[PDB]
Each structure stands twice: as structure tokens, then as C-alpha cells.
Symmetry: C3
Subunit: 229 residues, 3 copies
């Protein structure tokens, strides 16, 4: 890995403030909302960064960090990420499903594929045998591919049969999640959890940009449109 | 903290019997119920103490206790509480939401705010740095405040547009949960998990009275009325 | 217990392939399905073995094994089972509930009774005091009995008021789960997690036959009928 339990601190601390202020913004905003549908969109979307803040704080305060022996060392693995992402990604996926109006069957498949992507990714992070950490990465990425597939050629189709304001916001969000989401298995692979090419200092800066984007950025695009009505 | 892994035993054992008999009572009672709505109320309400019993038993049998180093010692932290409360409090919140007929958006916000209250409280209990245990307590209590706010000025409003039998049972329950619930962060703060003013022996007696009340007491008020129909 | 962290490997590895190919089969099959109801059945049913594969792999790769001191030794406890079963059994129970069209109250009772059966079984597996491991087993089995009761004299009744194709597939599935499910507490009791009569080598072969049957076998009976429409 890339030994780091203090230099990344600034990024952990900044991600804490951003997620923290991101929650605050969505909070002091859905406040007016009377429409039960928009009400659901603000609920899901506000909860995403709210969970992100607590876990980002845990990593900053040191709780979210653990040490796992693999290779020929003891590696600094921030597990709070998996704790965050486990509820955050299925919540993000529900916004997309509600927006486009997906079947209860597909929403269950997606949440299921997602829980598996995060749990499997968690087992990979905590696995002591260097070689095996890549098997789980393979299985985790495979599930993401399954998820990004229906989001693309599946939700897109169900979108075009909705009001244009809705068809387009989804278009924008769809692109943002498919692009952002696929960066995690890459950062993970080259980062301190896989082939230690990139230092934890950097891995943490990357995850931060992606997180704030995948949640607050995403939330902004959504919450600031009439598609949620 | 307040070193204790045997004197509180009587309270752990009594809370076990009470939760145990509380489940039994609700069990041999919803037995007749044919109304699918009352059927849901008995389901949720019976599951609350049923979960409470197992966790109370774990603490009595010693499993639910762990030791966390903070201050200048090794402190006896009963973590089973957080394991219990994590499912129990959202279940309790669903009874109130069903009774008053809340929006899927607000129920999601509440369960979300609640999961955060318990998890955050759990991180606070397990945190080794004395100072930080209070940050999480602050964040956990803040979420409770958010929860007790909608239960009060939110559910109350939605209650008044229901049959009077319903409007009033909620009134009673609302008061019981807002009053009881806000005692936990106080007991926690002065107890062995925070400023060790109160001994674990006592902290455990308090949590017991509050638990049995917040669940069996609460359940009795609810299940023994026609509001569940 | 029955010391084993390598001879059972072949069964762990075989259960991995079977669950793996079982998922694959259901995958390249619900592919056509346009009916949102059948769509839900394929979702739930495919997710069951998909989760089973990951956990079976964890046990094979060594991650799902831990050592618990009880009796006068350090016993090899495969905890991944409880991780698997926690989502898998409630999912299996939802197929039965959807098929027969159960009330939201009873589905909640069942999932609740089930979470308790697995968690309680998990506490029993991890408990260091030999004597106590049987208390949890008693509580876990009691919950299973509650579950198998409604599946039998409860769902059966609700089945007979459905299309005959549906009434019968449920009949078959009902029998398969009640029979298979009740074998787990027996295997557990005589296996390495309880009265070490049976060696881990064998306990693992038994759990494997039961798992593949309870999921892939079950799934086949269901997915290969028109009852899911
Ligand atoms: C309701 C109340 C609630 C909303 C209030 C929340 C306040 C909460 C944000 C305060 C956070 O307060 C953070 C603390 C700790 O900051 P540290 O010095 O960086 O800690 C490093 C530690 O030793 C472990 O490091 P390791 O993980 O690398 O091993 O004060 C240090 C504060 C930081 C200097 C500023 C951080 C600002 C946050 C973004 C907020
Ligand atoms: C279906 C079957 C199922 C319903 C039956 C459930 C029975 C179950 C309640 C029996 C419980 O049985 C409890 C046992 C243990 O009681 P102990 O002596 O107090 O154990 C202390 C331990 O050493 C750790 O203490 P530490 O946590 O402080 O470190 O018998 C001691 C029994 C107690 C003396 C009585 C307790 C009664 C319970 C309320 C029941
Ligand atoms: C998307 C990509 C994804 C679908 C691909 C998945 C491939 C994945 C199945 C490969 C599995 O690959 C398995 C590995 C390890 O097998 P081992 O030698 O048996 O490991 C024992 C270990 O030391 C701990 O044992 P302990 O738990 O008893 O302590 O290769 C050994 C391979 C085995 C010899 C073959 C197993 C086949 C599996 C059924 C597949
Ligand atoms: C239909 C089928 C036929 C196909 C289905 C299965 C197939 C699609 C799966 C193929 C890919 C999948 C197996 C996973 C492969 C992951 C791939 C990206 C390789 C990752 O590989 C990562 C490297 C790590 O390198 P270091 O050891 O640190 O040394 C370099 C140092 O940083 C300097 O090792 C690599 C070590 C090992 C290569 C890890 C593999 C275990
Ligand atoms: C809009 C904004 C401006 C306001 C938003 C933020 C604001 C609302 C938050 C204020 C409160 C929040 C920060 C949390 C404060 C918790 C408060 C109850 C203080 C708890 O404080 C507990 C004590 C513990 O005392 P001992 O060390 O054991 O010694 C005494 C011994 O028992 C005898 O320490 C206390 C030690 C430290 C004081 C703990 C703090 C960390
Ligand atoms: C209405 C009420 C009156 C009735 C409600 C409660 C009642 C229904 C509950 C009765 C059953 C319940 C208490 C659980 C009993 C479990 C029962 C199957 C006994 C299991 O018992 C397992 C054995 C383990 O044997 P080894 O020590 O390994 O030595 C043998 C070695 O293998 C050779 O010990 C056994 C040791 C102890 C017997 C374990 C018990 C604790
Ligand atoms: C720093 C931060 C990160 C700390 C973390 C705390 C955090 C864990 C708790 C917050 C939980 C949130 C993440 C949960 C998501 C909340 C969103 C879903 C809210 C969306 O809106 C849902 C509605 C539900 O009511 P209706 O059915 O009537 O429409 O909120 C009802 C709207 C209400 C009626 C209007 C007022 C709402 C405000 C926000 C609540 C009042 C604030 C409380 C009194 C706490 C005050 C703070 C303390 C310190 C005094
Ligand atoms: C000591 C205790 C704490 C041990 C803990 C065990 C515990 C974990 C398991 C219990 C799980 C419960 C907490 C789950 C909540 C249960 C409540 C929701 C029940 C509410 O009612 C729901 C209905 C569902 O059926 P319908 O759709 O037809 O209406 O129950 C159907 C009603 C049925 C049809 C009538 C009979 C119901 C009884 C209660 C079930 C029979 C009991 C079993 C045969 C076990 C017997 C005991 C063994 C030792 C012989
Ligand atoms: C070896 C294995 C065990 C690795 C484990 C990975 C695993 C964790 C991920 C799989 C998750 C699954 C368990 C989740 C269950 C999936 C089932 C519910 C699918 C049932 O069907 C649901 C529909 C939803 O779309 P509609 O609403 O339009 O009907 O699937 C939509 C049908 C789509 C539109 C048709 C094509 C579906 C295929 C299966 C998806 C394409 C495959 C991806 C491109 C990944 C390709 C593999 C990589 C290596 C190239
Ligand atoms: C086993 C015990 C069950 C016993 C109460 C018998 C219940 O049987 C009557 C049911 C209707 O089926 O309602 C019972 C409704 C009765 C009118 C109310 C009786 C309540 C009793 C006072 C028992 C209260 C026990 C506490 C709730 C548990 C505190 C420990
Ligand atoms: C707010 C957080 C978001 C949107 C996070 C998304 C995270 C992922 C898509 C993670 C994917 C992973 C893999 C595909 C394999 C390796 C491990 C993970 C967990 C990093
Ligand atoms: C049956 C159990 C009930 C109703 C429990 C309710 C528990 C709480 C409201 C706990 C609140 C907490 C805080 C507000 C902060 C400190 C930590 C907790 C978890 C004790
Ligand atoms: C796919 C897996 C299935 C269908 C598993 C079912 C498992 C059980 C019914 C387990 C039951 C247990 C008890 C009744 C008590 C002892 C512990 C358990 C968890 C083995």
C-alpha cells in the first residue's frame, strides 16, 4: 500500500466540511417542498451526503482507519468508505429509479447488485492474501458493470417515456454516475488497496473529488430542477 | 467510565425477563387479529421487544459487553444496546408513521435520521479518544432533535386529520417517545460512556426503565386501543 | 468442535462453483422476461445464489473462517454462513410471500423472525461459553419454528385462493423449505458449532447440499414454472 495516516488529513477534513455543508444546503432548501414526490427526492438526496459526512468525519478523527497486513507490510485501509457507500450508493440508485419510474423488480436487482459491489469491495480491502484482493475487485467491478448497464440501456429507455424535463435531467445524471462510478475501481486498483502505484495522499484526494461530485454535485443537478416534481 | 461487569447483572436479567414476557404478551394477543392494518401494528410492535430481549440477553450472558480504552482506563461498554436500538427505534418510528399516515418521503427521512443517530452513537461509544466521544454525541443528539421535531410538529398535524380515536392515541404515544427518547443522550452523557458521574450499575437501571417503557409501555398504549384498526 | 481449515475445502470450492453457475443460469434466463411480476421473481431468486457465491468464496479463500475458544480448544467457525443467510433467507421468504400474496404485516413478521433466527444463530456460533451456545440455538430454532408455521398453515391457506398453477408450485416449494430449513439447526447442533459429534469435513458437506438445494434447487422449481406470472 501507500503508508498514510496523517498527510491525507487535509482531504479528509475538507471532504468533511463539503459533505457537511452539502447536507446543510439541501436541508435549508427542501424545507418549503409540499409535493410528496419532490419530498422523497429531497429525503433520499439529503441523506446521501449526511451519511457521507459522518463517515468522512470518522476517517478524519481516525476511527475509519484500520491496518491490514498484505504484501510485506501493514497497510492503512480506510474502511469507513465501504460503510458510507453501502447505504449511499443504493440511495443514489433510488433517486435514478424514482425519477425514471422503474419496476420494483429492477430496483431490487440494482440494490442487490450494489450491496454486493460494496460488500465484495470491502472483503477485498480487508483481505490479507495479496493475490485474492484482486479476485474480489473483479467480482465487485463486474457487479458495477451490471449496475451501470441497466442505468444506461434500461433506465434511459424508461426515461424517454416521461416528461422532457424529466428525460433530460436523468440524461445528465445518468452520464455523471456512469462516468464517476467507474473511477472508483480504477482509483482502488492503483491506490493503497491494490497495486500501490499511487500514494494514499493522492488516493484520498481522488476519492474526495469523486465523492463530493457523485453526491453533492449529483444532488445539485437533481434538486435544482423541476424533474423532481 | 464506571467499571461494571457484574453488579448491573440484576437489571440486565430483569430487562431480559420483562422484554421476554412483553413479547409473549403481544404474541398471545395479536393472535386473533384479522384486520391487515392492525396486523401490521402487531407485527412491528411485537418485533420491537422481541429484538430487545435477545440483545438484553446478550448483555446478561456477557456477550454484549466489550472494553474500550479511554481516559486512563479500560471502560465496560455495552454495545448490544446500539445493535438493539438500530432496528428497534426505526420500527418504533414506523408505528407512529403508520398510525398518522405519513409520506414515504418523511418515513425515509426519519429512518435515515435514526440510523444515523444510532450508528453515530455507536461510534461515540467505541471511540478511544475521550474528547471525540462528545463530538459524535453532539451529532447523534442533533439527529434525535430532528426526529423528535417531525414527530411533534409534523406527525401531530397529520394526526388531527384522522379519526379522533387515532388522533389521541398518537397524542399519548408522541408524548411518551419525545419524553423518553431525550433521556438516552442524557443518561449516556453522565453515564459510563461519557462523563463518568453515574456508575454503570445505575446507568443500566436507567436504560432498563427507559427501554421497557419505550417499548412494552409504548406497545401497551398502542396495542390496547382501537387506533390500530 | 471438529478442527478443520483444509479438508472441507473441496466442498467449499464445489459449493462456490454450483452457486456461481446457479446464478449464471438464472441470469441468462430471466433475460427475456417482460412481465414485471416474473421480473420480481427473477430478481429475488437470482440474488439469492449470487450472495451465496460470494460468501462461499470467502469461506474457500479463507476469509469466512474465524477461531472461537470454547470447551477446551480453539474452534474453526465459518461465520460467512450467517452473513450469507441473513439476506438470503429473507429473500427466499419473499418469493414465497409474493407467490401466495401475503399481507405487509406478515411479511414484516417473517423477515423480522428471520433476522432474529440468523443473528441469534450468529451469536451462538461466536459465543465463548460452551453452555450458552445452546441457549441461542434454542431461541434461533424457536424463531424458525415460528417461520415454518406460517409458511405451512398460513401461506398454504392463502395459496388455495390463487390460480391452481400457483397453488401447486407453492405446495412444492413450501415442502422443500420446511424440510430443508429444519436440517440446519440439527446439522449445527451435532456439528462443530455445537456437540462436536460430526466433523467439520462432514458438517460442510451437509450445509453444501442443503444450501444448493434450498437456493438453486428451490429457484429451479420456481423459475421453471408459470406460477411466477
Ligand atoms: C451538531 C454538532 C455538529 C454538527 C458539529 C460537528 C463539528 C465537527 C465537524 C468537529 C470536527 O473536529 C475535528 C477535530 C480533530 O481534528 P484533527 O486534529 O485533524 O484529528 C486527527 C486525529 O488525531 C486522528 O487522525 P488520523 O485519522 O489521521 O489518524 O478538531 C480539528 C478541527 C479541524 C482543524 C477543522 C475541521 C473542520 C471540519 C470540516 C468541520
Ligand atoms: C425458546 C427457548 C427460550 C425462550 C428460553 C430462554 C431461556 C433464557 C432466558 C435463559 C437465560 O439463562 C441465563 C444463565 C446465565 O445467567 P448469569 O449467571 O447471570 O450469567 C453471567 C455470565 O457469567 C456473564 O456475566 P457478564 O455479562 O456480567 O460478564 O443462567 C442464569 C439464569 C438467571 C439466574 C435467571 C434469568 C431469567 C431470565 C430473565 C430468563
Ligand atoms: C467476474 C470475475 C469472477 C466471476 C471470477 C471468479 C473467479 C473465482 C471463482 C476464482 C477462485 O479462486 C480460488 C483460488 C484459491 O483456491 P485455494 O487453493 O483452495 O485457497 C485456499 C486458501 O489458502 C485458504 O483456505 P482455507 O479457507 O481453508 O483456510 O484458486 C484456486 C482455484 C480452485 C482450485 C478452483 C475453484 C473453482 C471455483 C469454483 C471457481
Ligand atoms: C469468461 C472468462 C474466460 C473471463 C471471466 C473472468 C475474467 C473476465 C476475469 C479477468 C480479470 C480478473 C481475473 C481480475 C484481473 C485484475 C487485473 C486488473 C490485474 C490486477 O493486477 C494487479 C497487480 C498488482 O501489482 P503488484 O504486485 O503490486 O506489483 C507492481 C507494483 O505496484 C510496482 O498484480 C496482479 C496479480 C494477479 C494477476 C491478480 C489476479 C488474481
Ligand atoms: C451554530 C454553531 C455555532 C453551534 C453548532 C455546534 C454546537 C451547537 C455544538 C455545541 C455542543 C457540542 C459541541 C457538544 C458539547 C457537549 C457538551 C454537553 C459538553 C460535554 O462535556 C463532557 C465533559 C466530560 O467531563 P470529564 O472529562 O469526564 O471530567 C469530569 C469528571 O466526570 C468529574 O467534558 C467536555 C470536554 C469537551 C468540552 C467535549 C467537546 C468535544
Ligand atoms: C414452556 C417451557 C417450560 C419450555 C420452554 C423452554 C424449553 C422449550 C427449552 C428446552 C430446550 C432448550 C433449553 C435447548 C436445549 C438444547 C438441547 C438440544 C440440548 C443440547 O445439548 C448439547 C450437549 C452437548 O454435548 P457435549 O458437551 O459436547 O458432550 C458430548 C460430546 O459431544 C461427546 O450439551 C447440553 C448442555 C446443556 C443441556 C445445554 C443447555 C443450555
Ligand atoms: C452537521 C450535521 C451534518 C449534523 C448531522 C445531523 C444529521 C445526522 C441529522 C439530519 C438527518 C437528515 C440527514 C435526514 C434527512 C432529512 C431530509 C430528508 C429532510 C427532507 O424533508 C422531510 C421533511 C419531513 O416532514 P413532512 O412530511 O411534513 O414534509 O422534514 C421536516 C421539515 C421540518 C418540519 C422543518 C424544519 C426542518 C429542520 C431541518 C429540523 C429542525 C432542526 C432540529 C430542531 C435540530 C436543531 C439543531 C439543534 C442543535 C438545536
Ligand atoms: C422467548 C422468546 C423471546 C424466544 C424468541 C423467539 C422469537 C425470536 C421468534 C418470534 C418472532 C417474532 C418476534 C416475530 C413477530 C411476530 C408477530 C409479528 C406476529 C404477529 O402476527 C402475524 C401473523 C401472520 O399470519 P397472518 O398473515 O395469517 O395474519 O402470525 C401468524 C399467527 C399464527 C398463525 C398463530 C400462532 C402464532 C404462534 C405465536 C406461532 C406458533 C409457535 C411456534 C409453533 C413455535 C412453538 C414453540 C416451540 C418451542 C414448540
Ligand atoms: C461470477 C459472478 C457470480 C460474479 C458476481 C457478480 C454479481 C455480484 C453481479 C450480478 C448482480 C445480480 C446478482 C443481481 C441480480 C440480477 C437479476 C435480478 C437480473 C434480473 O433482471 C432484472 C433486469 C432489470 O431490467 P428491466 O427493468 O428492464 O427488466 O435486468 C436487466 C437485463 C439486462 C438489460 C440484459 C443483460 C443483463 C446482463 C446479465 C448484464 C450485462 C453484463 C454486464 C455488461 C457485465 C459484463 C461482464 C464484464 C466482465 C464484461
Ligand atoms: C402469557 C400472558 C398472556 C395473558 C395476558 C393472557 C392474554 O390473553 C388475553 C388477550 C386476548 O387474547 O388480551 C389481554 C388483554 C387484557 C385485557 C390485558 C391484560 C394485561 C395484563 C395486566 C398483563 C400485563 C403484562 C404486562 C403488559 C407485561 C409487563 C411485564
Ligand atoms: C458517494 C459514493 C459513491 C457514488 C461511490 C461509488 C463507489 C463505487 C462505484 C465503488 C466501486 C468499487 C469497485 C467497482 C471495485 C473495487 C472496490 C470499490 C468498492 C472501490
Ligand atoms: C427501545 C429503545 C429506544 C426507544 C431507544 C432510544 C435511544 C435513543 C434515542 C438514543 C439516543 C442517543 C443519543 C441521542 C446520543 C448519544 C447516544 C445515544 C445512542 C444514547
Ligand atoms: C440458503 C440458505 C438457507 C435457506 C439457510 C437456512 C438456515 C437456517 C434455517 C438456519 C437455522 C439455524 C437455527 C434454526 C439454529 C441454529 C443456528 C442456525 C443459524 C444454523
Amino acid at each position: 500500500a501507500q503508508i498514510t495516516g496523517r498527510p491525507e488529513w487535509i482531504w479528509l477534513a475538507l471532504g468533511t466540511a463539503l459533505m457537511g455543508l452539502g447536507t446543510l444546503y439541501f436541508l435549508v432548501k427542501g424545507m418549503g417542498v409540499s409535493d410528496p414526490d419532490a419530498k422523497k427526492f429531497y429525503a433520499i438526496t439529503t441523506l446521501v451526503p449526511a451519511i457521507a459526512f459522518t463517515m468522512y468525519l470518522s476517517m478524519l478523527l481516525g476511527y475509519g482507519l484500520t491496518m491490514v497486513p498484505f504484501g510485506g507490510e501493514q497497510n492503512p485501509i480506510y474502511w469507513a468508505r465501504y460503510a458510507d457507500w453501502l447505504f449511499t450508493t443504493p440511495l443514489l440508485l433510488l433517486d435514478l429509479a424514482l425519477l425514471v419510474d422503474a419496476d420494483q423488480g429492477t430496483i431490487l436487482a440494482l440494490v442487490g447488485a450494489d450491496g454486493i459491489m460494496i460488500g465484495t469491495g470491502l472483503v477485498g480491502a480487508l483481505t490479507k492474501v495479496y493475490s485474492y484482493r484482486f479476485v474480489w475487485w473483479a467480482i465487485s467491478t463486474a457487479a458495477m458493470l451490471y449496475i451501470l448497464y441497466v442505468l444506461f440501456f434500461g433506465f434511459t429507455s424508461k426515461a424517454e417515456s416521461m416528461r422532457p424535463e424529466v428525460a433530460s435531467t436523468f440524461k445528465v445524471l445518468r452520464n455523471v454516475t456512469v462516468v464517476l462510478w467507474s473511477a472508483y475501481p480504477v482509483v482502488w486498483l492503483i491506490g493503497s488497496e491494490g497495486a500501490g502505484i499511487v500514494p494514499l495522499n493522492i488516493e484520498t484526494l481522488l476519492f474526495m473529488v469523486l465523492d463530493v461530485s457523485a453526491k453533492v454535485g449529483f444532488g445539485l443537478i437533481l434538486l435544482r430542477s423541476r424533474a423532481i416534481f
